[PDB]
Amino acid sequence: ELFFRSGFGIGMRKDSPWKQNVSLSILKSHENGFMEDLDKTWVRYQECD
Amino acid sequence: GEVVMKRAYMAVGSLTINEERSEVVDFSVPFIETGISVMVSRSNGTVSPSA
Amino acid sequence: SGQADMIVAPLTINNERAQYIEFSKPFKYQGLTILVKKRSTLDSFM
Ligand SMILES: CCCCCCCC/C=C\CCCCCCCC(=O)O[C@@H](COC(=O)CCCCCCCCCCCCCCC)COP(=O)([O-])OCC[N+](C)(C)C
Numbered sequence: 050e051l052f053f054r055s056g057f058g059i060g061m062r063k064d065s066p067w068k069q070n071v072s073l074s075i076l077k078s079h080e081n082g083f084m085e086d087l088d089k090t091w092v093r094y095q096e097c098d
Numbered sequence: 099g100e101v102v103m104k105r106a107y108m109a110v111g112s113l114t115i116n117e118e119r120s121e122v123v124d125f126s127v128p129f130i131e132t133g134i135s136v137m138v139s140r141s142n143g144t145v146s147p148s149a
Numbered sequence: 150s151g152q153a154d155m156i157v158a159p160l161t162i163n164n165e166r167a168q169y170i171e172f173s174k175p176f177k178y179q180g181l182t183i184l185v186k187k188r189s190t191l192d193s194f195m
């Protein structure tokens with residue numbers, strides 16, 4: 050079973066004038082289905098099982 | 099609305115982080131993953147049409 | 150150190166790293182898992 054359920058983030062420095070708009074452009078891409086596009090084309094392949 | 103109107107300083111609960119809310123309230127790191135899922139009553143289940 | 154302005158990689162959000170850098174909201178929710186090495190053995194009709 051999965052443990053230490055911490056996700057993947059974009060790292061920026063403490064100042065990071067882009068910190069707020071990067072996160073807002075990541076929540077937006079989850080809702081738009083853009084990340085489901087990326088999961089389909091890069092993660093969900095299922096060669097054999 | 100309570101945090102936006104400064105009636106409270108926190109909104110601990112089952113709030114999901116999203117676009118519109120993050121532009122009026124400052125969320126923290128998620129403590130549990132959620133999303134949108136579909137719950138369907140089970141269809142019992144059958145044998146394959148080519149068993 | 151200033152070499153990079155962003156880390157676009159599978160960087161896990163941690164308490165240790167969060168004290169020095171600003172992580173974004175996760176673009177991928179996941180966890181830790183263990184990977185291990187993976188028909189019919191009917192010898193004959195007898
Ligand atoms: C559904 C039930 C209803 C029907 C029932 C019918 C009644 C049956 C009637 C009679 C049977 C009488 C006894 C003889 C049977 C062999 C026994 C034996 O010791 O063989 C050995 C050598 O056998 C082989 O390894 C070869 C068998 C397959 C190839 C065919 C060669 C001829 C064998 C037959 C010649 C024809 C004889 C004709 C005259 C009788 C077994 O080798 P093993 O390595 O120990 O095998 C273990 C099994 N294992 C590999 C899966 C682990």
Ligand SMILES: N[C@@H](CCC(=O)O)C(=O)O
Nearest residue numbers: 112113114115132133134
């Ligand atoms: N938990 C959701 C509401 C429930 C839902 O509609 O899925 C929220 O904070 O807005």
